[PDB]
Amino acid sequence: AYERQYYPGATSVAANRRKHMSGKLEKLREISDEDLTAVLGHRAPGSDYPSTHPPLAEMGEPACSTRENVAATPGAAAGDRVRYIQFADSMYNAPATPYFRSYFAAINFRGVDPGTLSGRQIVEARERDMEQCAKVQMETEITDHALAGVRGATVHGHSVRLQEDGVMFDMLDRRRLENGTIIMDKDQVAIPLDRKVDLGKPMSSEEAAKRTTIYRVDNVAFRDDAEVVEWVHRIFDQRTKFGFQPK
Amino acid sequence: AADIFSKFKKDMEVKFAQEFGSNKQTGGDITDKTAKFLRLGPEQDPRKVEMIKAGKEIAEKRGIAFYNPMMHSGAPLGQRAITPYTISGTDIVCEPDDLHYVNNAAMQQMWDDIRRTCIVGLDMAHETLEKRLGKEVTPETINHYLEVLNHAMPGAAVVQEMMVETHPALVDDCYVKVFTGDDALADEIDKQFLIDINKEFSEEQAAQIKASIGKTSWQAIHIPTIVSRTTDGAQTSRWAAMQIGMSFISAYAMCAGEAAVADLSFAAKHAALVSMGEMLPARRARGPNEPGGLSFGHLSDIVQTSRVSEDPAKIALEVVGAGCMLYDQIWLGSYMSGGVGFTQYATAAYTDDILDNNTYYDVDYINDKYNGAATVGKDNKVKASLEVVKDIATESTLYGIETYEKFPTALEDHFGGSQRATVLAAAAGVACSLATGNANAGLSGWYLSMYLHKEAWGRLGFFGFDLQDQCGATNVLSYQGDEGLPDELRGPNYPNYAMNVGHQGGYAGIAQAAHSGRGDAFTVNPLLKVCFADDLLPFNFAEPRREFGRGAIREFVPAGERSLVIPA
Amino acid sequence: SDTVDIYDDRGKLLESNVDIMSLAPTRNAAIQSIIMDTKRSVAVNLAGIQGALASGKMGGKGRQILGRGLNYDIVGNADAIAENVKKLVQVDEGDDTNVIKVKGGKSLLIQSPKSRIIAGADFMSATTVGAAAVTQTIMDMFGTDPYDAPIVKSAVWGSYPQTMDLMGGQVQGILSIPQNNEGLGFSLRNIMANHVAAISNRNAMNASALSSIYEQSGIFEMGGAVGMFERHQLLGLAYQGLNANNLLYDIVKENGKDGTIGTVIESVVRRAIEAGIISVDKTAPSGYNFYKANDVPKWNACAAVGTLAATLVNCGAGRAAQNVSSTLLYFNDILEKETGLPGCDYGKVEGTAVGFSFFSHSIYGGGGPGVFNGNHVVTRHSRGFAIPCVCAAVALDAGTQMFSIESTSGLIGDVFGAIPEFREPIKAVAGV
Amino acid sequence: SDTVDIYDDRGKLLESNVDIMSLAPTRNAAIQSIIMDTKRSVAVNLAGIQGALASGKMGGKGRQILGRGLNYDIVGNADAIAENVKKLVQVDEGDDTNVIKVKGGKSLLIQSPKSRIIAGADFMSATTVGAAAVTQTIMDMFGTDPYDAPIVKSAVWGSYPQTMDLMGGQVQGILSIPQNNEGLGFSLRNIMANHVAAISNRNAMNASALSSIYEQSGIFEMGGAVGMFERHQLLGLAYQGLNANNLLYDIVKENGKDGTIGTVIESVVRRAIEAGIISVDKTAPSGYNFYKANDVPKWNACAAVGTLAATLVNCGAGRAAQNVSSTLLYFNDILEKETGLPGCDYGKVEGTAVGFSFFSHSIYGGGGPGVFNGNHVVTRHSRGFAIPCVCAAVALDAGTQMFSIESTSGLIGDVFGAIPEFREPIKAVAGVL
Ligand code: F43
Ligand SMILES: C[C@@H](OP(=O)(O)O)[C@H](NC(=O)CCCCCCS)C(=O)O
Ligand SMILES: C[C@@H](OP(=O)(O)O)[C@H](NC(=O)CCCCCCS)C(=O)O
Ligand SMILES: O=S(=O)(O)CCS
């Protein structure tokens, strides 16, 4: 029986990376089912999930061992559309970094299609399955809602200087600090919501620095986590050697 | 190095801490992590205002919708500050839009000057005249041939009666010069036709070129830009061959169309032709002399900085700039896609002295740790190894990352992860090439940078940025058929490289760096190095980055315009 | 001497103690039979020809030649046409020529005798002779006037020879045309993922099996399996492609109910340690164990199996083809971070998956997983270890794609899916 | 059905009563052996690799990578290299892999086992496996450091894969690469005439014989010999290519001393009338006889023989290759004007010859006769009846060409010219080797 170790390193950043990868994330706030559906913007809150094809139980499936041995998710079974949740995360110590959101999704959720980019990270999945993953990302420490933002388009901000109130720039102003709490009053493609969503009080810069999976020279320097630099060196060496001759 | 670091900081001050147009960025500390975003929209930028006005008027005039910033989702461009770019190594401050290739005649002309150029040997042609016709080829007959050729090449007649011809005013950029590794012949060539290798290159570099090509003679042909623009790259070698054939017929009193002429044709079109680049496979089908066929070594040799500078980093950096512009803005950003395209994917590597800062830091690090290995020399280089690559590339990348982190202005500047990846990896790769004299050690450094970058920030580039970078380290020293290749011979059609921005210009700089560190005359082809050692070409290939700046400020005069035949 | 036991798609033992060298495209009779049949066979759309003749719609998208209509009952004469086509396609009486009426006369399977492939440099004789046979047959059967001959010809051949292919024609094979090859030895890699899934009848592991056979036949023709690289590629073919030792099947099964890309990594690393293929090289201060591969080609094969197993689990759970691009990326990326060992193909599956993800989620090109193939600029880079997963992923899709199997490969699946060795390739290679 | 007697290049009977169907590429074992050997074989220039390694001159015209020199004695270790290359190229112990040292170790013949062609879609495995075997062998033998591996690789492979071919590499075969095909079924047509003449050892009729085998194998793969067109092409192959009934040899011999393109026409028409292949159809007022062909494919074969016979006579007289383009044009042009019957390939040999003449006498492209092939845009047009004459013409040239056999095809002649079935293809087909 193999116990996964996930990631090297012995700093707070490496420890936080293992927390994200293993899905051991502290719940910090609550979002209702309807508010989650509202911010995602794929259907009216509380409405039935639209479908892209009939339920598996209705149309039937080919009989092969994989379909028999691999259980379809509730979203696949229902024939849901594949929809998404996408985040931008500030490089100024947002808890999340793009690759580690994707690892979080790949390791802890079934039937997911994560994508990593510098300014955006996305999980595509059958809509109801996606909402399960979305809820954890919205509620737990993997997201600070000042330093991050749910953005399905026009994502610019991850590398831009922070606003003086500690909130990451949004071209389309979907969420901001109001009375010491983060309010989101548009969905992730910036269509105004009927009801604004309280995404809770932001982390202090101090707490963000402790919870972040990003290295920075003025918090926890990458150079100082020798194990992770060595890991890179070992992967590099081995890839180079085995490309010449796999021995 | 200190001077470049000061230049980088000045760039950040100009870009972020003093107003550009009406963006109201009237002050600030370039190390500050925070900023105020004014939500001014596109009107903060005078070029954008000009574009909006033109878009409105043209839409009204032509009767169908056109440029309109309000069609942008959510809000128009410029909700944060629209800020300028300074061309690296210069004080030329540019409107961002003026660096889009469509808006920049210098950028378009650099490509036209490459596209409309090929090199054709003379020796085979002369052997043909000697063997088949019994003709005696002398300096006199060659000089007469060259004057006939420089009449014929732009599109003028030498044999038939009742010919129409191209208007000289439309094709004034078309000409043919010659060069030769035979010093005795070079002394006899009418100087108006000669690219003098002994004059244009240092004694060491001239020796390398002449030893490489031997006592052989070559034509540097540049066909009309207006023709290149009407047609394509594959036009070039055909155009050159037609008028070479006509000029041999006329100058040597051959039958105007005999069997021996066909040998001159095959010599000019195939046997003694050197193209800028070769054809591309079906999915990206293109004939010769298109950007995808242009090997990284060939671009390094078209760029003339190696001839006029003794600074190996400067030489590499000019090639990076030229390559990022051509390969990303015109090739990948237009030929292979289009639209708004990839201006700033490229500008990150030739503006605001950020790449230069990382690179010159590396040079000092290498010189300090490796007994001046980054200074010009062939016998002061470090043996390429995994150890040396890991040392230099890791140090390079850590410094570059720390600079982005200590200067939030630099991070906002290169806002895309791909831009930062290109800069960090280019510096690391160029550094490894400089220290080792091994271009593929440079490639290894490039890929190691990407790997360190990814783990440092938990992000790298865009969705498909590191297809080649994850295939990268393992394919550097592979000798498998479609994997192995020296970087000098690699290019945009090397399978891993065939798609994605942010790389090809860097690889060209890495190829160049391996040879500039050695003081080599060329990176892979002396024929191209000499061909473009010529100030008559409209684009100054010795200063490609600065040329882009001259284009931005509308002081670059291109060839190929049609105002002569256009109404008032 | 590396041997494996071959298990089928349902995890049942087929053959024990098979030398992996006997599985080489260059030695294996079943694989060579699949290659020969792929080379020598084409589908002809008889209903398409009939419609093209009547309407003038031939030669490409939007094309119609007005005023030249020919009303020939092609489909109603399908049996007589098949018979005459066989007479023209065959080289000797009673040879291995096979012309079969498909879908109630709407199409034909035309299998040239192997003599046409033996006497040819490549595989285009199947297309040219097939098209010529059909063209001559229609000309004779319906008594076409010579001045209408061009119309009958292009109903079959489309815009060839103005185009390099039979654009807007009615003849298709599993392969493309040789000129579409990106590299040397790439012909058998230019097979659309939707084609393979169609032929497999949407059986995921048989799709990845057949794809593996094509891909490795390509790598062999590329000269990418010479010397030490032969064992390297054959371990991959055996384990990832042919379910060697039931490893693929067992890993999928134990992760099938609740498994993710992440749990498949646990299965792969646990089994690799159990088999002695990898062991701890060094333990860091944090407790992190850096591993070393004791058999590098075998470790690569473990990673290859894991990549496909993760695809079957993750695409299987979603019943969605698109999950394959991220699966190939993150299985290998996360595997490297778990172990300190390089992923499958030493980064090249991960790399292929990075661009493959991009070009299946962006504006720039590509498309859904089904349009990709080993000759595609996006997905060529890995040495045969990525595309088999794509074929399996497409087979598992329950209906999320615009460019589905039916959309791109309906004719191919109908014409070629009935060939036993094609539909059951693991059993074919095992010798049943 | 149709039978012919096969005569060799010296006009001697080899086999009688040969059914022309047995001569089909799709049925004939000897032709299939020639095709297989052509597919599975490449030449490697060991001297070239050694020079490239030392100088860095690799990857194409003008290319040199400075400062990366490797001094390996490739030629001096040619036998050991050949041994190890065979071990890497072979598939089964004791199979039909063949690796031979040629030119005192300056080059190798690498013949892959048939299994690589059987398991392959086309023919490039001979090149890629051959190059891979040489690359691996040099890497091992000379202990190349991994950071020098790219230099060893490109010494062999040139600019591949930046280029689609091994540009500036040291591996060549008789064929090209598949992507150079203009049409479908054209791979065996992409063989330059100089190659065939080199392999034939400048034997005119064996050059045209081998070319006919390649060309008609191409026409067959093009699907241009289906149904009635099979007899049509095989009559051409038998008569023009394989000297059926000694007609080609006899027509050349009786026109050899003093004959011209014009007198060859007299021979062709006289013999066609004697054989009953053509008859007077109608006589015009002037007395001019309009002929009719009683057997159209046979008449075409007569015109095909006449075209090659005229080439052998006209190019032979001048010992000059260039005469072939006008010979193909005017033999058929004048034949039509003599008889009122269509020339060979019903105008297409004449047509091919019109453009071929132009593109071997002008500024626009082409070259001397030796650069052309059945896949060349200029000379593809006739169904295999033109290029065999070009190969014979090149074989007869005494030294008028810049792009001679030695210039373009020296390695090919050295490496492939000693293969018995290649140098004596008529004897191969008659089964008398
Ligand atoms: C719509 C896509 C999907 C796709 O296939 N391509 C896009 C868009 C495309 C469009 C954007 C033009 C427009 O606004 O209409 C163009 C210009 C290509 C074109 N059609 O001309 C482009 N990308 Ni993109 N794109 C770019 C970038 C990026 C970076 C931006 C990150 C950030 O924080 O701002 C991210 C990827 C990443 O996160 O790494 C990105 C994504 C995307 N890129 C996401 C949209 C993301 C969003 O919603 O904002 N680009 C860059 O990082 C720099 C270069 C820049 C390109 C323009 C230029 O080079 O000047 C542009 C290049
Ligand atoms: C993949 C391929 O597209 P297709 O899948 O064939 O449609 C290819 N495009 C590109 O590679 C475009 C690359 C430049 C734009 C993206 C840059 S990161 C091409 O058009 O030939
Ligand atoms: C024959 C071929 O030339 P090559 O033999 O390949 O050099 C071809 N030229 C042409 O067909 C040129 C045609 C236009 C000029 C002559 C018009 S009659 C080409 O360049 O691809
Ligand atoms: O967002 S994507 O990475 O697909 C395109 C970047 S320009």
3-state SS of B40-76 is CCHHHCHHHHHHHHHHHHHHHHHCCCCCCHHHCCCCC
Give strand pairing partners of A197: A184
Query: What is the fold, at CATH topology level, of the domain defined by D1-40+188-433?
Result: Methyl-coenzyme M Reductase; Chain B, domain 2 (1.20.840)
Strands A181-186 and A175-178: antiparallel
Domain boundaries, chain B: 5-114, 115-289, 290-525
At D13, the amino acid letter reads L
Report phi then psi at D415, rounded to 5. Answer: -90, -35
Ligand 3 proximity of D368 Cβ (cutoff 6 Å): no
Of the candidates A119, A231, A233, the beta carbon closest to that of B390 is on: A233
Q: Choose among C385, C330, C403: nearest CA to A122.
A: C330
Query: What is the fold, at CATH topology level, of the domain defined by D41-187?
Result: Alpha-Beta Plaits (3.30.70)
Residue positions counted in chain A = 247
Check if the beta carbon of residue A59 is closer than 8 Å to that of residue A51: no
Angle between helices B235-251 and B139-152 (to 10 degrees): 130
- Residue to mutate among A11, A13, A122, A161, with most B CBs inside 10 A, is A161
**Residues C149, C128: Cα–Cα separation, whole Å:** 17
Q: Write the CB contacts of B60 (distance below 8 Å, at least 6 apart in sequence).
A: none
Ligand nearest to the CA of D192: 3
Is residue B464 within 8 angstroms of chain C, CB to CB? yes
Of the candidates D63, D161, D368, the beta carbon closest to that of B263 is on: D368
Q: Where in chain C is the domain with CATH 1.20.840.10?
A: 1-40+188-432
Strands D107-111 and D98-102: antiparallel
Check if the beta carbon of residue B423 is closer than 8 Å to that of residue D132: no
**Residues B42, B39: Cα–Cα separation, whole Å:** 9
Look up tokens 């029986």; give the residue: A1
CB neighbourhood size of B139 (10 A): 14
Summary count for chain A: helices (H), strands (E): 9, 7
Strands C289-293 and C278-283: antiparallel
From residue C243, give the alpha-carbon distance in Å to each of A65, C17, C314, D44: 13, 14, 18, 39
Report phi then psi at B421, rounded to 5. Answer: -65, -45
Q: Please report the atom of ligand 3 found closest to the CA of residue B270.
A: 7
Check if the beta carbon of residue C144 is closer than 8 Å to that of residue C130: no
Q: Write the CB contacts of D87 (distance below 8 Å, at least 6 apart in sequence).
A: none
Q: Provide the CATH number for the domain around residue A187.
A: 3.90.320.20
Check if the beta carbon of residue B103 is closer than 8 Å to that of residue B368: no
The verdict on whether omega for the bond into residue D342 sits within 30 degrees of 0, i.e. cis, is no
**Residues D107, D257: Cα–Cα separation, whole Å:** 41
Give strand pairing partners of B182: none
Q: Which residues of A touch C262 (CB under 8 A)?
A: 4, 21, 103, 106-108
- Reading the block at residue A176, the tokens are 């901001």
Q: Choose among A154, A80, A93, A151: nearest CA to A122.
A: A151
**Residues D199, A46: Cα–Cα separation, whole Å:** 81
Check if the beta carbon of residue B396 is closer than 8 Å to that of residue A223: no
**Residues C355, A101: Cα–Cα separation, whole Å:** 19
Q: Do A246 and C297 touch (CB under 8 A)?
A: yes
- Reading the block at residue C75, the tokens are 């489909």
**Residues A108, A102: Cα–Cα separation, whole Å:** 10
Q: Choose among D424, D430, D352: nearest CA to D386.
A: D352
**What is the CATH architecture assignment of B115-289?**
2-Layer Sandwich (3.30)
- Reading the block at residue B156, the tokens are 């003028």
CATH 1.20.840.10 applies to domain B290-525: yes
Check if the beta carbon of residue D389 is closer than 8 Å to that of residue D332: no
Query: What angle is formed at CA D66 by the lines to CA B120 and CA B281, rounded to 5 degrees?
Result: 55
- Residue to mutate among B462, B468, B471, B475, with most C CBs inside 10 A, is B471
Of the candidates C346, C347, C377, the beta carbon closest to that of B499 is on: C377
Q: Which residues of A touch B390 (CB under 8 A)?
A: 233, 236-237
Alpha helices in B170-258 (DSSP H): 183-186, 197-200, 203-213, 225-230, 235-251
Q: How far apart are the first and last CA of chain B?
A: 54
**Residues D371, B263: Cα–Cα separation, whole Å:** 10
Determine the 3-state secondary structure of A115 from DSSP. strand
Q: Where in chain D is the domain with CATH 3.30.70.470?
A: 41-187
Q: What is the CA radius of gyration of chain B?
A: 25
Q: How far apart are the first and last CA of chain C?
A: 23
Give strand pairing partners of C13: C7
- Residues before each break in chain D (C–N > 2.5 Å)? none
**Residues B392, D421: Cα–Cα separation, whole Å:** 59
Q: Choose among D321, D324, D308, D297: nearest CA to D243.
A: D308
Q: Write the CB contacts of A60 (distance below 8 Å, at least 6 apart in sequence).
A: none
Query: What angle is formed at CA D62 by the lines to CA D59 and CA D63, rounded to 5 degrees?
Result: 35
Q: Which residues of A touch B79 (CB under 8 A)?
A: 171-172
**Residues B520, B118: Cα–Cα separation, whole Å:** 23
Q: Write the CB contacts of C13 (distance below 8 Å, at least 6 apart in sequence).
A: C5, C6, C7, C246
- Reading the block at residue A111, the tokens are 């039937």
- Reading the block at residue A202, the tokens are 């932001």
Q: Write the CB contacts of B539 (distance below 8 Å, at least 6 apart in sequence).
A: B106, B109, B110, B113, B547
Check if the beta carbon of residue D320 is closer than 8 Å to that of residue D368: no
At A155, the amino acid letter reads V
Give the gap in angstroms from C-alpha B475 to the nearest C-alpha of chain C: 9
- Reading the block at residue A25, the tokens are 């994330």
From residue C341, give the alpha-carbon distance in Å to each of C173, C230, C269, C280, C337: 41, 22, 10, 11, 8
- Reading the block at residue C301, the tokens are 């094969």
**Residues A28, B484: Cα–Cα separation, whole Å:** 51
Q: How far is CA A119 from the centre of its chain?
A: 12
- Reading the block at residue D177, the tokens are 């690469």
Distance D366 CA to ligand 3 centre (A): 7
**Residues D299, A147: Cα–Cα separation, whole Å:** 88
Phi-psi region of C287 (alpha: psi -120 to 50; beta: other; left: phi over 0): left
CB neighbourhood size of D51 (10 A): 16
**Residues D179, D174: Cα–Cα separation, whole Å:** 15
Query: What angle is formed at CA C192 by the lines to CA C211 and CA C394, rounded to 5 degrees?
Result: 70
- Reading the block at residue B542, the tokens are 């010795």
Determine the 3-state secondary structure of A192 from DSSP. strand
**What is the CATH architecture assignment of B5-114?**
Alpha-Beta Complex (3.90)
Helical (H) or strand (E) element with A89: strand A82-89
Q: Please report the atom of ligand 1 found closest to the CA of residue B341.
A: 21
**Residues B321, B545: Cα–Cα separation, whole Å:** 6
Residue positions counted in chain B = 568
Alpha helices in C193-260 (DSSP H): 193-199, 204-221, 228-236, 247-254
CATH of domain C1-40+188-432: 1.20.840.10
Residue positions counted in chain D = 433
Helical (H) or strand (E) element with C301: helix C296-318
From residue B444, give the alpha-carbon distance in Å to each of B456, B552, D211, D422: 18, 35, 49, 48
- Per the structure, the count of domains in chain A is 1
As a dihedral over the C-alpha atoms of residue C13, residue C14, residue C20, residue C21, rounded to 10 degrees, the angle is 170
- Reading the block at residue D48, the tokens are 């070239």
Helical (H) or strand (E) element with D17: strand D13-19
Report the 3 state secondary structure along B435-489. HHCCHHHHHHHHHHHHHHHHHHHCCCCCCCCCHHHHCHHHHHCCCCCCCCCCCCC
At D326, the amino acid letter reads S
**Residues D239, D234: Cα–Cα separation, whole Å:** 8
- Reading the block at residue B481, the tokens are 């058929």
**Residues C49, C110: Cα–Cα separation, whole Å:** 15
Q: Do B451 and A235 touch (CB under 8 A)?
A: yes
With 0-12 / 13-18 / 19 or more C-beta atoms within 10 angstroms meaning exposed / middle / buried, residue B129 is buried
- Reading the block at residue C207, the tokens are 């799709």
Check if the beta carbon of residue D314 is closer than 8 Å to that of residue D393: no
Report the 3 state secondary structure along A26-55. CECCCCCHHHHHHHHCCCCCCCCCCECCCC
What is the residue-wise DSSP string for D49-74? Answer: HHHHHHH---SSTT---TT------T
Determine the 3-state secondary structure of C211 from DSSP. helix
Helical (H) or strand (E) element with B121: strand B117-121
Give strand pairing partners of C109: C43, C100
What is the residue-wise DSSP string for C50-118? Answer: HHHHHH---SSTT---TT------TGGGHHHHHHHHHHHH-SSTTSS-EEEEEGGGTEEEEE--HHHHH
- Reading the block at residue C128, the tokens are 């040219």
Check if the beta carbon of residue A181 is closer than 8 Å to that of residue A125: no
Check if the beta carbon of residue C246 is closer than 8 Å to that of residue C11: yes
Which one from D7, D160, D288, D364 is the annotated catalytic residue? D364
Is residue C367 within 8 angstroms of chain D, CB to CB? no
**Residues C270, C255: Cα–Cα separation, whole Å:** 13
Q: Choose among A106, B265, D196, D418: nearest CA to C334.
A: A106
**Residues D139, D117: Cα–Cα separation, whole Å:** 26
